[PDB]
Each structure stands twice: as C-alpha cells, then as structure tokens.
Amino acid sequence: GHMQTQGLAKDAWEIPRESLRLEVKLGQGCFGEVWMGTWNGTTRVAIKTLKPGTMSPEAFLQEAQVMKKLRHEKLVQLYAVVSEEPIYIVTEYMSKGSLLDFLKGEMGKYLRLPQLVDMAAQIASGMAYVERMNYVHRDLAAANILVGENLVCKVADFGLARLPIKWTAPEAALYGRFTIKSDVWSFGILLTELTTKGRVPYPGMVNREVLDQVERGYRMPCPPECPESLHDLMCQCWRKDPEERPTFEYLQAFLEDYFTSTEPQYQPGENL
Ligand SMILES: CC(C)(C)n1[nH+]c(-c2ccc(Cl)cc2)c2c(N)ncnc21
C-alpha cells in the first residue's frame, strides 16, 4: 500500500565484515585468494580476498565496480562487498569449480560434443551480454569460467575488465589493442580447451614460439574427433583482422543451433 520512498540512497552492496565467514580455501592467485563460506551463516557464498601490499586497494575494487554494472545469468553474480581492508568480494558460489578443472577432472572424460558445444553456447551468451554493454573481458579462458549445477557455465574474473599469451589475440598482446574482438579470439582458443578436455593450447610450444608462429599465420589444427565445421568457427575467431572475427551474438546463435543447422550428420564417438 504505502511504499518506502525515503532512505533508499543506501549502498545496495556494502556489508559488515562480521556478517562474513570464510570457511574453505578454493583458490589462490597473485593478488589474493578465493574462499567458500557463509554470508550471515545462512547463505553459502564465495569470497575473493586481496593480499596486502600486492595491489592498490582501489584497483582491486575495480573488478567489484564492473560487477555492480554487469548483471546476467551467465555471469557470476556479485552479492556483497567489503571495500575496507581487509577487502572482500562476495558472490554466488559455483559448485563445480573452474571449467578447466572440470574438463580435466574425472567427470570431464565422459563429456561429449553436445554438452561441450552447449557450454560454449552458455559462455557465448555471457560474452554476448558483455558485448552489448560495451565492455571487454581481457582474460577469457577455461580457468576463468565457473561451472555450477546442471552444468551451467558462467563467465568470471573481471579483474582486468574495463569499458597469458596463448589465449591473447596478437594485436592485444603486442600493441595493447584489447577489444571485444580480442575477446572473440580468446573464445576461439577456449573452444579448443573444451574439445580436448582442457589441454593447454599450442601443445609443445613455448610462449615466444607461439607469438612468432601466430604472426606467421599459424593456427592450431582441428582437434581429434572435432567436426571440421567447429574448427572453421575457431579459425574465424582467429582471423588476423579483428574486424573479420564474428560477434559473440553470432557465436551464441551458431552454437545454440549447431546440431541441427551445421552438423546434422553428427554421430557420437570415443571422446567427442
Ligand atoms: C578460482 C575458483 C574456481 C576457486 N573460484 N573463483 C571464484 C570467484 C569468486 C569471486 C569472484 Cl569476484 C570471481 C570468481 C569462484 C566462485 N564464485 N565459486 C566457485 N569457485 C570459484
């Protein structure tokens, strides 16, 4: 009847550190760690912390800011934050960990092309949302994709997202030209991770050899049992000119319709 209209300028994110409870350590990087815990003892959550004197507390909070502006079912959802050191970033908890570990774990060996292409579609949808919001991820890879119940996949790690050479587009790694298109290149590399059970891209090739090679026009071959049509999509993602590469909007549609429109004769196999 009579709605509250006053006192709404309150920060819908900030919360008291006392309401948090870090339980299990799930991750650890250069600028902090990730823990699983409870938000007010009743909500299981994920908390990304920061290692003191490893990054400006102001810079760290940037990933939090981006996450305040971006909302989508295929993006990890931010729940709350603690902007005062020790700084904490609270988000929904993804039960199956990173896509990378899922792929090379025991439950990954049973995955086949239909599930794998579907996951790519989910990721593409997430990136499509980022795409239309005029943002760039800069670090799209399997290690930065989170998996949840029912194999839902969500883009995470927007630490370096604003308005690793084996995953980075040439122009981006060489001249710092990070765009949604250098992100499309990354998705292409990600597609190889999905079709090889998480194998590292460019097998047997060191970082410096990779740059030389890709500049000389080298591109990874079609993975074993991977339909040539899918490899062709990867090659479109790795086109030299960033503007030749497809949009995530295009990729999302292509993958969602894959098995009826592109690979109608698909038949199961030993690994894909
Ligand atoms: C590294 C790993 C796989 C343990 N990890 N990292 C995050 C994560 C937490 C906060 C932000 Cl802001 C971004 C990602 C995460 C999560 N929510 N749920 C499960 N595992 C997670």
Under 8 Å CB-to-CB from 132, ≥6 apart: which residues? 249
Sequence length of the chain is 272
Annotated catalytic, 183? no
Q: Residue 228 has which token pair?
A: 């040539």
Angle (CA) 184 122 220, round 5° = 40
Question: Could you tell me how far CA 103 lies from the centroid of its own chain?
Answer: 14
For residues 83 and 234, what is the distance between their CA atoms, to the nearest angstrom?
A: 40
Catalytic option among 118, 139, 241, 257? 139
> Tokens 């894959």 — which residue?
258
Among 189, 248, 180, CA closest to 214: 189
Q: Which residues line ligand 1 (CB under 6 A)?
A: 26-27, 34, 46, 48, 63, 76, 89, 91, 93-94, 97-98, 146, 156-157
For residues 258 and 256, what is the distance between their CA atoms, to the nearest angstrom?
A: 6
Pocket-testing residue among 24, 25, 48, ligand 1, by greatest number of atoms within 8 A of Cβ: 48
Question: Within a domain: residue 202?
Answer: yes
Question: What is the per-residue DSSP string for the chain?
Answer: -----SS--S-SSB--GGGEEEEEEEEE-SS-EEEEEEETTSSEEEEEE--TTSS-HHHHHHHHHHHHH---TTBPPEEEEE-SSSPEEEE---TT-BHHHHHHSTTTTT--HHHHHHHHHHHHHHHHHHHHTT-B-S--SGGGEEE-GGG-EEE---TT-B--TTTS-HHHHHH----HHHHHHHHHHHHHHHHTTSPPSSTT--HHHHHHHHHTT--PPPPTT--HHHHHHHHHHT-SSGGGSPPHHHHHHHHHHIIIII-TT----S--
Atom of ligand 1 lying closest to residue 93 CA: 18
Contact 220, 201 (CB under 8 A): yes
Domain total in the chain: 2
Ligand 1 centroid – CA 46 distance (Å):
6
Contact 121, 256 (CB under 8 A): yes
For residues 29 and 260, what is the distance between their CA atoms, to the nearest angstrom?
A: 41
Q: For residues 116 and 249, state if they share a domain.
A: yes
For residues 189 and 205, what is the distance between their CA atoms, to the nearest angstrom?
A: 14
Question: Within a domain: residue 88?
Answer: yes
Dihedral, CA of residue 233, residue 153, residue 105 and residue 46, to nearest 10: 140
For residues 243 and 254, what is the distance between their CA atoms, to the nearest angstrom?
A: 18
Q: Residue 28 has which token pair?
A: 């650890």
Atom of ligand 1 lying closest to residue 157 CA: 13
Ligand 1 centroid – CA 233 distance (Å):
29
Tell me the CA distances in angstroms from 103 to 70, 97, 191, one per residue in order: 27, 10, 12
**CATH number of domain containing 242:** 1.10.510.10
> Tokens 């990933």 — which residue?
63
Question: Could you tell me how far CA 152 lies from the centroid of its own chain?
Answer: 12
For residues 69 and 30, what is the distance between their CA atoms, to the nearest angstrom?
A: 25
Question: Within a domain: residue 1?
Answer: yes
For residues 9 and 142, what is the distance between their CA atoms, to the nearest angstrom?
A: 38
Q: Which of 62, 93, 124 is the endpoint of a domain?
A: 93
Q: For residues 199 and 142, state if they share a domain.
A: yes
> How many other CB atoms are there within 10 angstroms of residue 4's CB atom?
6
For residues 221 and 232, what is the distance between their CA atoms, to the nearest angstrom?
A: 10
Ligand 1 centroid – CA 45 distance (Å):
9
Q: Which of 93, 108, 140 is the endpoint of a domain?
A: 93
Ligand 1 centroid – CA 34 distance (Å):
6
Q: For residues 248 and 189, state if they share a domain.
A: yes
Q: Is 216 left (phi over 0), alpha (psi -120 to 50) or beta?
A: alpha
**CATH number of domain containing 8:** 3.30.200.20
Tell me the CA distances in angstroms from 110 to 103, 116, 121, 237, 250, one per residue in order: 10, 11, 19, 27, 28
For residues 119 and 186, what is the distance between their CA atoms, to the nearest angstrom?
A: 15
Range of the domain at 81: 1-93
Q: For residues 167 and 195, state if they share a domain.
A: yes
- To the question of whether residue 28 is assigned a binding role by annotation, the answer is yes
For residues 63 and 45, what is the distance between their CA atoms, to the nearest angstrom?
A: 17
* C-alpha Rg value of the chain to the nearest Å: 20
Angle (CA) 247 165 74, round 5° = 40
Give nearest CA residue, ligand 1 atom 19. 94
Ligand 1 centroid – CA 194 distance (Å):
19
Atom of ligand 1 lying closest to residue 92 CA: 17
- To the question of whether residue 29 is assigned a binding role by annotation, the answer is yes
Solved with: X-ray
Exposed, middle or buried, 207 (CB in 10 Å: 0-12/13-18/19+)?
A: exposed
Atom of ligand 1 lying closest to residue 26 CA: 4
